Design a protein around this ligand. Sequence first.
Ligand SMILES: *[C@@H]1O[C@H](CO)[C@@H](O[C@@H]2O[C@H](CO)[C@@H](O[C@@H]3O[C@H](CO[C@H]4O[C@H](CO[C@H]5O[C@H](CO)[C@@H](O)[C@H](O)[C@@H]5O)[C@@H](O)[C@H](O[C@H]5O[C@H](CO)[C@@H](O)[C@H](O)[C@@H]5O)[C@@H]4O)[C@@H](O)[C@H](O)[C@@H]3O)[C@H](O)[C@H]2NC(C)=O)[C@H](O)[C@H]1NC(C)=O
Ligand SMILES: *[C@@H]1O[C@H](CO)[C@@H](O[C@@H]2O[C@H](CO)[C@@H](O[C@@H]3O[C@H](CO)[C@@H](O)[C@H](O)[C@@H]3O)[C@H](O)[C@H]2NC(C)=O)[C@H](O)[C@H]1NC(C)=O
Ligand SMILES: *[C@@H]1O[C@H](CO)[C@@H](O)[C@H](O)[C@H]1NC(C)=O
Ligand SMILES: [Fe+3]
Ligand SMILES: [Fe+3]
Length: 685
Amino acid sequence: NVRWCTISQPEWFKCRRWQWRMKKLGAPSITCVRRAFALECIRAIAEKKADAVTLDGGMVFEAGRDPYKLRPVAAEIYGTKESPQTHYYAVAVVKKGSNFQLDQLQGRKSCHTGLGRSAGWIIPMGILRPYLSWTESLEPLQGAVAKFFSASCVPCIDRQAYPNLCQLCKGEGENQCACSSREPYFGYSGAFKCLQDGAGDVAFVKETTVFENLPEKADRDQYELLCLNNSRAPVDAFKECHLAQVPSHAVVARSVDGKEDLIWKLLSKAQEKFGKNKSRSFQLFGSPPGQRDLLFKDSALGFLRIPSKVDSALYLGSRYLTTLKNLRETAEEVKARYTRVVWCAVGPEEQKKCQQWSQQSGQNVTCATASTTDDCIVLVLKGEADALNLDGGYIYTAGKCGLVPVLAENRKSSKHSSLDCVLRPTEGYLAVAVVKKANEGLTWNSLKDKKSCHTAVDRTAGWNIPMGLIVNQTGSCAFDEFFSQSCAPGADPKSRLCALCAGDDQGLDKCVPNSKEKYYGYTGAFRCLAEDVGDVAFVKNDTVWENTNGESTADWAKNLNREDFRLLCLDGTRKPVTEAQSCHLAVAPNHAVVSRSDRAAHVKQVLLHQQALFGKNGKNCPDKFCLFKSETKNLLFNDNTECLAKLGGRPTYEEYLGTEYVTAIANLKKCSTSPLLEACAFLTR
Ligand SMILES: *[C@@H]1O[C@H](CO)[C@@H](O[C@@H]2O[C@H](CO)[C@@H](O[C@@H]3O[C@H](CO[C@H]4O[C@H](CO[C@H]5O[C@H](CO)[C@@H](O)[C@H](O)[C@@H]5O)[C@@H](O)[C@H](O[C@H]5O[C@H](CO)[C@@H](O)[C@H](O)[C@@H]5O)[C@@H]4O)[C@@H](O)[C@H](O)[C@@H]3O)[C@H](O)[C@H]2NC(C)=O)[C@H](O)[C@H]1NC(C)=O
Ligand SMILES: *[C@@H]1O[C@H](CO)[C@@H](O[C@@H]2O[C@H](CO)[C@@H](O[C@@H]3O[C@H](CO)[C@@H](O)[C@H](O)[C@@H]3O)[C@H](O)[C@H]2NC(C)=O)[C@H](O)[C@H]1NC(C)=O
Ligand SMILES: *[C@@H]1O[C@H](CO)[C@@H](O)[C@H](O)[C@H]1NC(C)=O
Ligand SMILES: [Fe+3]
Ligand SMILES: [Fe+3]
């Protein structure tokens, strides 16, 4: 049983018509909950009084927020049968023979589909905003818009407060300018009817609205499209004369106990039975004259199922998310947001370092925190954060979600002193497998059923290199059953890969992938080996050196003689820590700062500026703040980092990491699926 939320009597009548029509096809059953508007349904679903409803992108946004916390489980697909699309275009339709252009809309009368709707509100108001003369302190956007156009019809608007924005609305009193089918001028088709009846000079609807209302070209010849360059165009030239491409309408459900399986089941069979061109009796994507788009959009081809990790912000995307959120902020807030760089911190300790950086940077750098690196990637994707420095295996994940490399970590080399660190090339680190010397008979061959220590899952040295090699050599994909017990932060806490993880000093958050887990990272995985919790540690060369022989002042690593450890070589021999060059697993590319394509240049410029103040030969280091020092913790950047080096021209994730490593990651990735990887797949549609 799925409870569908309807916001009107004509929508309720279709649901009920769909409910009876379902029964004979066998499960699931559909219930028709009656509400008045979109937010009521949002609240109904959140309160478990209903299960599904289809919203427009502006509503999708609001439904994802607290305290609703709803996610889009399926999206409507538009377009043709052979040429589908899962987005649409917001356009401005004018009647042919008008002298106004897009700039000349002040003092005109307009038609809108709804307040806070994609094509009808959000999209057109982000374009008109310079013409608005909005002084944000005196009134809201609705107040600036009210004095911009003369009369109008924008349903859902406060009729009592902005009567001119409801003045052109064709509704009957105290139901006129309503947020549903009650107002005849509501919706895309209702907006077109407002233009067609000559009430408004322009209607803001989608690209197919004029095609669905005027079947013959002769009547369609009397309309035009206002383009962005302040020109005009014919209605079939929408793909060149639109305002923005907006993501399609999605069905939403609860994040927890959402009934998404039943919802999809029901949606799949309905679309297969009464879809577009499927039956004579019932049309799912077909609704009555005078009341279009009931439940779903009219002439929608079907439903595209959305991946579990994709939320409402991810579904909508940073581009739409910017424009929506930018309308909510002021010009100066918007200005300041683009200027500031928001760094993403993984964990508690990193956040503290970032906050110190922020205050020392005079709020030039701002922080955001996530508990994992993956969460931070997601925040970068959402636009909530701007950047973070990442290990190569995470860079793969970020690049597959479209983030690009900006600057790489560059430490002290053996050759140059000449060429500046910024202009000096990265050398790459050596991936090693370290053991205690006192456990003789431990070779690379005798590795099965031993205890292991990894920096984290998906990382280069602690994960991708040894597990990729082991999978290849075993010829199996069950890495969970290779070692007897491990500590690989990022695995299932109830699995055996988390079995040796410590948690904090209270022992909570065991196997978490951040600095609060005792055995996390380069430092923690060595510590795991050093304290004899595991038999092998997969880390880099530098870690062994930095944590032995008086280098580390930490009490666990303070009494460590470097001659008590060996390096397992891939030829079955052991070697001392001085011959890492002849005994390593692979060479890994250095950790780099990733960012979004449009933020990359700004982030780069800013990071160069910050490096001069707080870096290795920083002006404020070491008396004020040192960006690369974290008390051997490697918070934000590795403590050994000499500077952040510039990369070459255009490099993608594949170019930075390298074909061989990318393919190596690729083959290892076939053994297990990542939800985030599935979600980024869908976002790069
Ligand atoms: C595997 O990783 C190794 C570590 O990353 C790497 O060895 C490093 O190699 C680089 C260049 O290749 C060396 O850089 C050179 O450093 C010298 C100056 O070094 C001296 O001072 C540093 C810093 O000392 C201070 O800071 C530390 C820690 O913050 C404090 O403990 C210390 O008290 C100081 O306050 C120090 O690290 C060096 O110590 C090393 O060498 C001495 C003997 O010389 C040893 O007794 C000691 O245990 C340690 O091994 C040294 O005192 C500089 O003048 C040169 O121009 C150059 O920049 C690094 O020092 C070296 N690091 C270490 C820890 O050895 C290996 O190259 C790498 N292997 C491969 C195959 O890649
Ligand atoms: C684990 O095994 C897999 C499968 O053998 C390894 O992937 C293989 O990697 C090699 C080199 O990285 C690929 O070969 C290359 O092919 C190209 C184009 O044909 C050629 O120009 C290169 O010179 C090279 O020969 C090979 O295609 C690839 N195999 C598959 C099935 O993708 C993987 O690297 C191994 N893992 C680790 C950690 O070494
Ligand atoms: C912040 O950036 C501005 C502009 O580049 C610069 O003048 C200022 O000194 C910076 N402050 C810090 C501490 O980075
Ligand atoms: Fe819409
Ligand atoms: Fe690494």
